[PDB]
Amino acid sequence: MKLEHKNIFITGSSRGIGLAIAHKFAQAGANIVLNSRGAISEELLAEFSNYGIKVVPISGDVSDFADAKRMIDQAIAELGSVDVLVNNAKMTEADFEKVLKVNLTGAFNMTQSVLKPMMKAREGAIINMSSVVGLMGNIGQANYAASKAGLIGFTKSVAREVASRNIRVNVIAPGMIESDMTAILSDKIKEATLAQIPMKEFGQAEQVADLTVFLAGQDYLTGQVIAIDGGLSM
Amino acid sequence: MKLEHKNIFITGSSRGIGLAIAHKFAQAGANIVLNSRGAISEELLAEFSNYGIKVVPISGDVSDFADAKRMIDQAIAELGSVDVLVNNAGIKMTEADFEKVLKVNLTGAFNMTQSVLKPMMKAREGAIINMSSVVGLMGNIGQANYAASKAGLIGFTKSVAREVASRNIRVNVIAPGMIESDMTAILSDKIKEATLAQIPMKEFGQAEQVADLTVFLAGQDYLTGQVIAIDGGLSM
Amino acid sequence: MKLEHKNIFITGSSRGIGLAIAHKFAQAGANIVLNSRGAISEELLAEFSNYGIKVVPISGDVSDFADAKRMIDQAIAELGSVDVLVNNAGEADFEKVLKVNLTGAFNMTQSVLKPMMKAREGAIINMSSVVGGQANYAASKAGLIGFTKSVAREVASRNIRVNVIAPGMIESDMTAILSDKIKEATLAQIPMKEFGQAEQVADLTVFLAGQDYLTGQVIAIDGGLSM
Amino acid sequence: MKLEHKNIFITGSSRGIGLAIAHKFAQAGANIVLNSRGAISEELLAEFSNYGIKVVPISGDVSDFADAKRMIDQAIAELGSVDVLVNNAGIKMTEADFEKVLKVNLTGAFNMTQSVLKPMMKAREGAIINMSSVVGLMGNIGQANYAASKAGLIGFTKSVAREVASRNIRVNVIAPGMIESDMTAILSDKIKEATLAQIPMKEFGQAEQVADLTVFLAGQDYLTGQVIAIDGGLSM
């Protein structure tokens, strides 16, 4: 009931967890922006034409400051507003570092872009999300932890500045999620991976979606970091 | 859906936020244990009659280890299991009554947790939610004692969560802020505008919002060891 | 020597970990209180008489608040003061011992704080019990950790350091005499593939007692067991 | 003595905390590698000639993996082995390259750790001590970058500790707080008093406390994967 007819911008929502988040927001009656760095296909656009909600495809590069502002502006012109922004996010360590920086920059830019309209409406929610945890070497673990800390400090800073304007700003930290590849991995490497999760199991994408939609509709909750990772980041 | 027919032991649930928590869980279809240091009235039980669940009163002293064990067993007997424990214990007063209420929250959280962990670890399932005490009007000495007790409840919760994760038990802390109470409508505007000025979001919480978070956490698998303030940014 | 003539009250110091801690403190030149539920044997006192320190025996029940205060008062009466408190924690029997140990740490900590707070200094070192399941083991170790953080917060502004040591599996008589296939399966569970030694716990306890500006820490000495 | 004749490689030990650490290791009878980006002055080597230990100057760039590898090989060839690696860091001017010294120090821990792990794993013995930088007075962007690089150093340390525990190698991080230094008298009474009031023990730390903790960890067996804050309770 709290989310019906609200307008949700979900970055990276053509695949994976972002798509699960978008299905869950749609099941709650909210209007949906589907967003990808690539194109949104008519396939995907049709999965969402059974909920009786407005669905809008908006592609672009969140990591380009002006293009992030363009994407927020398009959503406002097509839906009327953005009530909720969900900032959902290689092989060498150097390329892995670059990917983390791109996703962090994208979260920064989209957050900066919606602040002005949300602050006018005295209304809105921003949910920043660290990336799903994969297998990483020592240096990848370090780079992962550094960029996650960066996202948390930024998000807490923004939470403090916009509280008096009734904008709620929170971070969700997923852990290791099952995928179709999990079935394919060796029982050896699963066992050494599970060993590092206190709850000794992998997460599911739908758990992240449930938490995301719950936070979106939950007044009076701001500045929080909520890990949903079976204890991984304890 | 995910809480329907689950069994919820809610301590200190005869009034206030505890009682609001009990109502949300009943609205989710969970059976509930209403608990108080003293007797539970027939008119309080009457409030839950249209929910189509089981409601059990168990009164006792959560801060007495023997009676904490007694109350958990009695809840298992009458309901079948304890799937969720919500520790919300403790109820003008001076600083000494304030320390005592803080120590009751901790002791009761400790004892009720230790008791319920015996069946939950054998069943390999369960959720425990520790509630810090609602934040009221506090001076110098008061905030110091509050901060130390909260550090204790958080440290306790994170440590327990570490210890029991391998047996599939989730343990989290909720930290309510300044919550609107039946009292609040009769406070004076000077004291109200002066405490609102301390809250980043410039408003008071609702008991129902604390209840919503409590019920959500209880059903949310794979979330453990978290501290979630619901306080309009007071603790930021 | 940061510890010569400091006054160390060491609960449960007649055997095992507590005895090893008492020896390390005595080796650093500190005065020590040897404590146990029963009487301190004459032998034990004599095993400490050539360190050149004051050795004070004080028997009693830590899990009884009035006796806890009697014991601290007695130690303050016999030594200068109590500069360092070490709260050492060695079926339904298992539950009663954990309860005595956790209550003991609470009672002795409360009794020793007023003198330390007035002095602007002190150190309290809590000990969780060694590993090797129970609800009670989990809750009690967590209880001690939560109490330690609460007290560290409470007393930091008076320059009093409060820390917990969490030992892992320690070799003992009990370890040494069991199946060599159970030890194999047991050591396999420890990332450093070996058992700890009481003397390692003792070195850590002495270091924290003497180390300024370190408080509120939970330090596992467990071969990575809890990483 | 547990450190007598052990071979200690201390990065950034020509001045500040790193130098203090070197002196504490020499007082424990350990052989020392003094290291800096520039060349080690003969006057600094003279401070150590009196200890009856062996003292070896090795300069280079820790943030260059090839030169990191070579520095380690040089130390093995002049001392026999590296038993303990201390990845030391630390610092008036800009925000532009506060980030630069953080990243250089951080990647330095990366390369030196990666380089010494081969001979320690073969030797089946060893210790690695990483150290976050001293907490100083920082703008908001400073604190943001400080928190990120510290989080990165901790994740690196925990990951390596897991990797090498089975080959008897101990890996830990020290997290200093605010160290009283030359920037302490200059600061105004409003500034010290307000800063001191944010530290729970209400006082500034000393470099010697960090050096003492470093020496203790180097010699303490069976202790690995720990993050040890010596910061007056700042991060409790």
Numbering used by the authors:
A (entry chain A): 1 to 89, 99 to 243
B (entry chain B), D (entry chain D): 1 to 91, 99 to 243
C (entry chain C): 1 to 90, 102 to 143, 149 to 243
Excerpt from the paper describing this PDB structure:
One critical component of FAS II system is 3-oxoacyl-[acyl-carrier-protein] reductase (FabG), which plays a vital role in the elongation process necessary for the production of both saturated and unsaturated fatty acids, utilizing NADPH to catalyze the initial reduction step, facilitating the conversion of 3-oxoacyl-ACP to 3-hydroxyacyl-ACP intermediates. Recent research has identified fabG of S. pneumoniae as an essential gene through CRISPRi assay, indicating that SpFabG may be a promising target for the development of anti-S. pneumoniae agents. The strains carrying plasmids producing either functional FabGs or the yeast OAR1 exhibited the same growth as the wild-type strains. These demonstrated that SpFabG has the capability to complement both E. coli and yeast in vivo, thereby functioning as 3-oxoacyl-[acyl-carrier-protein] reductase FabG. When SpFabG amino acid sequence was investigated through multiple sequence alignment, there is a conserved NADPH binding site along with the Ser-Tyr-Lys active triad responsible for substrate catalyzation.
We have determined the crystal structure of SpFabG at 2 Å resolution using AlphaFold predicted monomer as template for molecular replacement, shows casing its similarity to the overall fold of the E. coli FabG. In the asymmetric unit of the crystal form, there is a single tetramer. Despite the slight differences in the flexible region among the monomers, this analysis primarily focuses on the structure of the most stable monomer, chain A. Overall, the protein conforms to a Rossmann fold, with its core comprising a twisted, parallel β sheet consisting of seven β strands flanked on both sides by a total of eight α helices. The active-site residues (Ser140, Tyr153, and Lys157) are clustered near the loop connecting β5 and α5. The conformation observed in the crystal structure is considered to be inactive conformation, with the Ser140-containing β5-α5 loop occupying the pocket where the nicotinamide part of the ligand should be. In three out of the four monomers in the asymmetric unit, this loop is stabilized by a crystal contact, and the electron density clearly reveals both the conformation of the loop and the active triad. Phe223 in the α8 interface plays a crucial role by facilitating a π- π stacking and attracting the relevant side chains towards each other, and Ala236 in the β7 interface interacts with Gln233 in β7′ by forming a hydrogen bond. It is noteworthy that the hydrophobic side chain of Tyr229 inserts into a hydrophobic pocket on the neighboring side, resembling a key inserting a lock.
